[PDB]
Design a protein around this ligand. Structure first.
Ligand SMILES: [Zn+2]
Ligand SMILES: [Zn+2]
Ligand SMILES: [Zn+2]
Ligand SMILES: [Zn+2]
Ligand SMILES: [Zn+2]
Lengths: 97, 47, 187, 99, 245, 127, 114, 497, 138, 65
């Protein structure tokens, strides 16, 4: 069933933050993606068995992160790149500066 | 701004001018499916 | 090497149907009674007319053909209809297309059935390639795709009558009757 | 409105820039026909056409000067052309059509 | 009957209450501008002022209206003959190179077949059309002088309802035309071979039958176009839940 | 019966008050690549359904009297042998009323299976 | 499709006894007897008869929901008088009257012609 | 979530650095090369050519193969391909931007039209917003159409007094007018020419760091030279899926079609420049590659729509995907179809408590809740396991440590069952369970409220009447939604808030 | 509505003809200041001329509609004060039936043309299940 | 579509009374009102059953197969 825009706002109104994440993730879109620690892209080749990862063109074999995002999100980001836009994802609020 | 009317263009103008997103917005945490600075996500619980 | 399997893991049987389920999905074995993935792939839900395509010769793409009433094509229609009409000259574009368009004109006129009327036109595209004593006349092998096209039901033939129609019912029809017997015995 | 299209409008549509640089004359409309493979032309009825997923359409013949078949015009279930237009009550029940 | 061309004409009244010289202009099809009424009138044969204003104002004692027309004359006083009035169009959306001659005919053709197409599309009916343009401008000014209200858009006796007949008619045309044109194509190609009658013919069979079907079957009243939002769902599957429905 | 709900005499309902019939008809059609009505049995494909094929006859059609439900297979189709057969709609269930085997112009095998149920006024039924 | 079976209105299932006696906690000498597969017909008849006893301080009943055929009967009696006996007595008084009703009716019916 | 372990650390996204793909990085990232506009067939033989969707990208037919990453059509984040265009092409979303940059920088030497010398310019350079800088600087030097050699402090700067063009948008191109030869050379008319891509490239490649800074450009994440598409990224199979309706033919996607159109338009161009080059007759194919590359991303502009008669026409172009309502962001990211919901007609029940909700038995049996096997419950839980998914106080599925799922309706795991501690028992929604019940439209906090469950017969959601006005419902046939919290914290958040 | 119908379209020509045979001074020879009290006639949006004494024309026309000579569908509007007479023969005008009240009745006042005698003639057809609806229109 | 056996509200047998009612209309030449009352149908619940029933079955029977 549709848990569209409006239903979300109510949950935000109640302040029900965890429930909101379980609804928009754990029920529906829930996907795991590997990310380059350097260029926030989904360009990591996932070789789960030889622990081999690689980013190529970044040469990351060490600096790689795993995230939990909704598959629709993963699509939006990929479709952006498809349009030459880079949605770089970083795993630290401590902004560079 | 994505979530409202001028989605595509907003992203373009944002990509063009290298915008950094804090990710401290409710609507932004929803897109990434994480807890947001809402009631339950305004404090951190530790041991 | 591509190996794809659903083997339960716990009690390998090598191998048995695991169910498609009705609502839950995941194909749990009636053996170890475990799970495999989450499925999440509805094949019944194909792209309707509301994007899907059923190509029989190569791969269909399309270009231009603008008609949306937003801004008039006028100047731009001729800009793009000429520009796409220049491109259908680069690498032997004509031949299969000419054959299939002329094919749908000769059958439609005699009202040949689409389901098997189109079936024989696929046979022609298999016969136009391969080089086996065709002594090809275009019209000749067309009377083969006029016979197998009428093979759907006796729609217009009475194939002899459609042979007696128009031109070339004799020796050139003989070359063609042979080509069909050779194509049928070709595995 | 449909009887006006069959009887008049339709004949008027044939006569315009019809003559070529071949002229078309009177145009006739038979009662719904069935052109099927493996057999004769059959007289179609509303009921048969609804069950078999057919098009209740009739012969549209033209008189070409230098008689000639041109398409099928789906008929409005009760116009001058439809068999039901004249059918009686007992007839309708026999054609499996609600009176 | 026959084709059913829709080319609206617009007599505009430039200038609001109390502006400097309220001018009256008109919007023609396939022309990238507007032309003051006096000019179209002289282009129709009616040259002199007053003979023009006799086609508009139906009383010489109505100085009020005749006064409003004064600034109209002012525009056209640049042109005094049928040739220049046909020429003030300089054709239009066709222009650049051609000098005269070519353009004048484009104009004649427009005032014949594309301008006020109902009434008559023939040749020698200029006075009938001129008189109507007048009447149009009279109705325009009647509402500009506050003598008569604005036209009521919602008046039902000014609206129509296209049933089975008229719709099928539109379609039948398009498909009968696409037919007649394919005949011209199969007419060609045969550079000779003498007889070529058997080759032609039997086309109308399929083309018309699929077009009559496809529309009545879908709701797209256009055949493979759909870009024509006539697809608005004419021909819907019949309601059958209750007798009354 | 507040806010536009209504209490109904269950006893009248038992006597037939406001019962209705409900027919729903499913339908299906058919170079040397032809579809066929039949009772499939794998080979070697395996693309089949959860539904029960046991109620179907050899022609791939269910006979009238047969009572159906859930996802039961109403028409069996096959084309080496990928299934493409219309089961009954998941929530529905009733009794096969009639089956009809026709020919659409292009010598196609046409099949309409009608299914009948009787719907009795229940608590959520709108009046 | 969620409708219960019609016989669940008078046929006790598994682990359902006609009666369930639970001592009330509010008052003294008070008892809530749950009736299974019974409706107003009994509930109201037993309540009314229980009110005729001059040693009965309280007696009510209630179908807690129309969906399930079951009711509760609360009874409170004077010290020393068991509510269960009050119940019995009621039940008996009920059977007697009905007994009389039966014969008196049967007597009049015979005296009738048609 | 449901996938395999990883030695990679799990993290939360904290920043989103937006930018543009350098034609260098597109190649450095890519794995494909894409030569052929065909898809699968090789003399009929089914597979996939090194053209579209194949060389190293994801797959179809349930094949694990995918850039040595294995995993298969699930957990394969699609991988990006590569595709080199002949003559560089403009990007539809940036045309608008590209004019504004051209009108703001002088052609040839690629310098700003104004320096700190102009006091109006000084004020505009102090502003700290990409939006405001680039807009203020534009409005301040769009008028000027001469590259000043000398300005009063006369001071000296960039030397090349060439006249600037007055740029106008026509279709997918930029045409400019000049004003030169001082009424002696020629006679009167300007020099109307079309500004090609290769020109704009050099200009934008030759502008310096501090001219980027002045404009909304990072130099690292966005250089103006990248608003122009040299190298085009190819989106993997997961963005553009396949599979059909019958099962004997293709059944392809729209994006793929336009990508094939891009390739044909690109191949025929490379053809003319190597073999027979008929000069200014080639440009008729460049604007086609410009049209497809641009149309692949947008098909509502001011030019002309798209194909094809059949399919879903006109096509989609990524724009249509992302676009608000019924598309990604609106109908996929911030509004999803969630699991564990239920909908029915509602009715009044006056014997319910305010805070309850009558859930019809059937819905209770379908809706599940993942509770953890615990000494506090084993008895109750084990008992449910035995009641099975066809009796109300039962259960379906039983989860373990690893992640196996023992379907209970199919044969599960042997005889009397032996529940182990830590396992999870998806158990039917029982009485008193917290649930989020709502009626749409949800324009309130009141439209979304947690209720105590009460499992009843018949198939209608039954609610207390006093709860009527906050959902703004009545029982004329109103339907309502139900959601079941899945976590132990998530329950707490419904019964506490 | 229950009684509404729609115009199907008649030929305009036989009326345009009939007009100029009963006045209808053709628009070619119109002298506005010479005939001020004159009414201007319209057929299907076209101005076909002018006509003094439109009052007699009007009655003639309505009688021909009611006798059956001019198709009943055809609508005829006389805006007396406007000095205009518009005839429509267009296809697609919604229309409805009405009783006629023409006061032509010597035995007192204004009355409906239909009478009790026409009705027992109508009900006479009903009982046989020759007086139709058309016969009430004719 | 046939006479309802037993009225919905009362439950009194009503299916056995249709031909009797039809006869009292046609031949006896009575008014619906009295016809019902002579059949024992005194109360409006058991009365609307017969008065309101449309014997559609008589038209369904006219279909040949
Ligand atoms: Zn990297
Ligand atoms: Zn197993
Ligand atoms: Zn992968
Ligand atoms: Zn310069
Ligand atoms: Zn009754």
């Amino acid at each position: 069933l549709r848990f569209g825009e409006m239903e979300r706002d109510c949950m935000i109104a109640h302040g029900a933050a965890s429930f909101l994440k379980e609804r928009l993730m754990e029920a529906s879109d829930a996907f795991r993606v590997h990310i380059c620690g350097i260029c926030g892209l989904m360009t990591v080749i996932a070789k789960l068995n030889h622990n081999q990862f690689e980013c190529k063109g970044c040469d990351n074999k060490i600096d790689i992160y795993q995230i939990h995002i909704p598959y629709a999100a993963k699509l939006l980001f990929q479709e952006l790149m498809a349009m030459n836009i880079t949605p770089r994802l970083y795993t630290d609020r401590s902004r560079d500066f | 701004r994505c979530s409202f009317e001028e989605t595509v263009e907003i992203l373009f103008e944002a990509g063009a001018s290298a915008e950094l997103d804090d990710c401290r917005g409710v609507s932004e945490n929803v897109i990434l499916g994480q807890m947001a600075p809402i009631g339950t996500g305004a404090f951190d619980v530790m041991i | 090497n591509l190996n794809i399997v659903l083997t339960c893991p716990e009690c390998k049987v090598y191998p048995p149907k695991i169910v498609e389920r009705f609502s839950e999905g995941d194909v749990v074995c009636a053996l170890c009674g475990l799970v495999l993935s989450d499925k999440l792939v509805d094949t019944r839900s194909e792209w309707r007319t509301f994007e899907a395509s059923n190509p029989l010769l190569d791969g269909n793409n399309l270009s231009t053909r603008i008609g949306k009433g937003e801004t008039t094509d006028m100047r731009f229609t001729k800009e793009l209809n000429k520009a796409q009409g220049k491109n259908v000259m680069d690498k032997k574009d004509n031949e299969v297309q000419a054959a299939f368009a002329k094919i749908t004109m000769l059958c439609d006129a005699a009202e040949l059935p689409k389901i098997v009327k189109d079936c024989a036109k696929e046979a022609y595209k298999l016969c136009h390639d391969e080089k086996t004593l065709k002594g090809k006349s275009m019209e000749s092998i067309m009377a083969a795709s006029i016979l197998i096209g009428c093979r759907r039901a006796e729609v217009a033939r009475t194939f002899k009558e459609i042979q007696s129609l128009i031109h070339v019912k004799t020796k050139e029809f003989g070359k063609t009757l042979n080509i069909m017997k050779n194509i049928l015995r070709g595995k | 409105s449909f009887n006006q299209f069959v009887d008049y409008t339709l004949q008027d549509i044939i006569c315009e820039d019809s003559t070529l640089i071949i002229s078309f004359g009177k145009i006739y409309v038979t009662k719904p026909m069935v052109n099927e493979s493996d057999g004769v032309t059959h007289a179609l009825y509303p009921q048969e056409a609804r069950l078999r997923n057919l098009t209740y359409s009739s012969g549209l013949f033209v008189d070409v000067k230098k008689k000639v078949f041109i398409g099928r015009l789906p008929i409005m279930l009760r116009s001058k052309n439809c068999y039901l237009s004249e059918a009686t009550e007992s007839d309708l029940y026999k054609l499996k059509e609600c009176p | 009957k026959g084709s059913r061309f829709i080319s609206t004409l617009q007599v505009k009244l430039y200038g609001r209450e109390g502006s400097s010289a309220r001018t009256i202009k008109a919007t023609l099809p396939y022309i990238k501008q507007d032309i003051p009424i006096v000019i179209i009138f002289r282009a129709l044969g009616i040259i002199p002022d007053g003979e023009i204003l006799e086609h508009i104002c139906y009383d010489v004692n109505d100085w009020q209206m005749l006064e409003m027309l004064k600034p109209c004359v002012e525009d056209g006083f640049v042109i005094q003959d049928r040739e220049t009035a046909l020429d003030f169009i300089g054709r239009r959306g066709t222009a650049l190179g051609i000098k005269k001659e070519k353009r004048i005919q484009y104009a004649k053709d427009i005032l014949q077949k594309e301008f006020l197409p109902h009434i008559t599309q023939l040749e020698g009916f200029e006075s009938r059309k001129a008189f109507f343009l007048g009447y149009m401008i009279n109705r325009l000014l009647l509402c500009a002088l506050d003598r008569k209200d604005q036209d009521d858009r919602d008046h039902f006796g000014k609206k129509r309802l296209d049933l089975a007949g008229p719709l099928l008619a539109q379609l039948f045309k398009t498909l009968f035309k696409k037919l007649t044109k394919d005949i011209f194509r199969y007419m060609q190609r045969t550079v000779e071979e003498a007889h070529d009658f058997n080759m032609k013919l039997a086309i109308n069979a399929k083309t018309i039958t699929s077009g009559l079907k496809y529309a009545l079957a879908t709701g797209n009243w256009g055949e493979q176009k759909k870009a024509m939002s006539s697809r608005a769902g004419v021909s819907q599957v019949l309601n059958r839940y209750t007798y009354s429905s | 019966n507040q806010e536009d709900s209504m209490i109904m005499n269950q006893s009248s309902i038992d006597r037939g008050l406001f019962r209705s019939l409900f027919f729903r008809s499913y339908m299906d059609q058919e170079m040397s690549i032809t579809e066929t009505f039949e009772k499939p049995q794998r080979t070697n494909t395996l693309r089949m359904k959860h539904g029960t094929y046991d109620k179907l006859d050899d022609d791939g059609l269910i006979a009238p009297g047969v009572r159906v439900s859930g996802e039961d297979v109403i028409i069996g189709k096959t084309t080496s042998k990928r299934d493409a057969s219309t089961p009954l709609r998941s929530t529905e269930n009733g009794i096969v009323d009639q089956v009809l085997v026709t020919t659409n112009q292009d010598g196609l095998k046409f099949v309409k299976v009608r299914v009948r149920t009787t719907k009795i006024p229940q608590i959520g039924d709108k009046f | 499709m969620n409708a219960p079976d019609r016989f669940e209105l008078f046929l006790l299932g598994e682990g359902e006894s006609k009666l369930k006696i639970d001592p009330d906690t509010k008052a003294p000498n008070a008892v809530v007897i749950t009736f299974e597969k019974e409706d107003h017909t009994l509930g109201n008849l037993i309540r009314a008869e229980l009110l005729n006893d001059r040693k009965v301080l309280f007696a009510a009943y209630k179908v807690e929901h129309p969906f399930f055929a079951r009711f509760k009967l609360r009874i409170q009696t004077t010290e020393g008088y068991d509510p269960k006996d009050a119940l019995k007595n009621a039940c008996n008084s009920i059977i007697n009257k009905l007994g009389a009703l039966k014969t008196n009716f049967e007597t009049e019916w015979n005296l009738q012609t048609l | 979530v449901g996938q395999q372990y990883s030695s990679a650390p799990l993290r939360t996204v904290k920043e989103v650095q937006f930018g543009l793909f350098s034609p260098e990085e597109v190649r450095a990232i890519s794995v494909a090369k894409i030569r052929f506009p065909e898809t699968m067939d090789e003399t009929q033989t089914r597979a996939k050519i090194g053209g579209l969707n194949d060389p190293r990208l994801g797959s179809i037919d349930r094949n694990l193969k995918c850039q040595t990453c294995q995993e298969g059509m699930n957990e394969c984040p699609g991988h990006f391909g590569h595709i080199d265009l002949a003559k560089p092409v403009f990007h539809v979303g940036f045309i608008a931007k590209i004019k504004k940059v051209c009108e703001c920088v002088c052609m040839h030497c690629g310098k700003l039209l104004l320096d700190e010398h102009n006091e109006l310019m000084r004020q505009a350079l102090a502003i700290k917003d990409s939006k405001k800088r680039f807009a203020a600087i534009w409005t301040l030097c769009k008028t000027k159409m001469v590259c000043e050699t000398d300005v009063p402090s006369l001071v000296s700067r960039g030397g090349c007094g060439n006249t600037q063009p007055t740029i106008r948008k026509d279709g997918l191109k930029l045409v400019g007018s000049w004003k030169k030869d001082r009424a002696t050379g020629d006679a009167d008319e300007p020099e109307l020419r079309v500004l090609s891509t290769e020109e704009i490239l050099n200009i934008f490649k030759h502008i310096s760091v501090k001219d980027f800074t002045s404009l909304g450009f990072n130099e690292v994440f966005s250089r103006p030279e990248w608003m122009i598409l040299t190298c085009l990224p190819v989106p993997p199979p997961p963005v553009r899926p396949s599979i059909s309706f019958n099962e004997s033919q293709r059944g392809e996607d729209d994006l793929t079609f336009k990508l094939a159109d891009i390739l044909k338009a690109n191949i025929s161009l490379e053809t003319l420049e190597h073999n027979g080059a008929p000069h200014h007759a080639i440009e008729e194919a460049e604007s086609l590659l410009q049209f497809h590359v641009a149309t692949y991303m947008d098909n509502d502009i001011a030019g002309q729509p798209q194909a094809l008669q059949k399919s879903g026409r006109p096509v989609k172009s990524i724009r249509a995907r992302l676009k608000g309502k019924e598309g990604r962001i609106r109908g996929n990211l911030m509004g999803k179809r969630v699991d564990f919901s239920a909908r029915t007609v509602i009715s009044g029940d006056p014997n319910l408590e305010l805070d309850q909700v009558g859930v019809p038995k059937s819905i209770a049996k379908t809706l599940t809740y993942p509770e953890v096997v615990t000494p506090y419950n084993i008895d109750r839980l084990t008992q449910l396991v035995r009641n099975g998914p066809n009796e109300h106080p039962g259960a379906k599925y039983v989860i373990r440590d690893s992640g196996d799922r023992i379907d209970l309706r199919y044969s599960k795991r042997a005889g009397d069952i032996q529940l182990q501690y830590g396992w999870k028992v998806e158990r039917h929604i029982m009485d008193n369970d917290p649930v989020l019940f709502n009626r749409q439209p949800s324009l309130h906090k009141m439209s979304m409220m947690a209720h105590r469950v009460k499992v009843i017969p018949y198939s209608t959601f039954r609610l207390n009447l006093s709860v009527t006005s906050p959902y703004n419902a009545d029982f004329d046939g109103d339907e309502m939604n139900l959601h079941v919290p899945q976590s132990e914290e998530t329950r707490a958040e419904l019964s506490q808030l | 509505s229950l009684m509404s119908c729609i115009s199907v379209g008649t030929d305009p020509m036989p009326i345009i003809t009939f007009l100029s045979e009963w006045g209808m001074e053709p628009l070619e020879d119109y002298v506005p200041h010479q005939s001020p009290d004159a009414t201007r006639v319209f057929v299907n949006g076209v101005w076909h001329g002018v006509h003094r004494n439109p009052a007699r024309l009007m009655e003639t026309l309505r009688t021909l509609r009611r006798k059956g000579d001019i198709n009943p569908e055809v609508s005829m509007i006389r805006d007396i004060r406007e000095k205009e007479l518009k005839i429509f023969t267009d296809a697609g005008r919604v229309y409805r039936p009405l009783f006629i009240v023409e006061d032509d009745e010597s035995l007192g006042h204004k009355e409906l043309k239909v009478r009790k005698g026409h009705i027992a003639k109508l009900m006479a057809t009903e009982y046989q299940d020759e007086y139709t609806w058309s016969s009430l229109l004719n | 579509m046939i006479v309802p056996v037993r009225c919905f509200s009362c439950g009194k047998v009503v299916g056995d009374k249709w031909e009797s009612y039809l006869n009292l209309l046609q031949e006896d030449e009575l008014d619906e009102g009295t016809a019902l009352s002579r059949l024992g149908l005194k109360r409006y619940c058991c009365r609307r059953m017969i008065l309101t029933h449309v014997d559609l079955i008589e038209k369904f029977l006219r279909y040949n197969p």
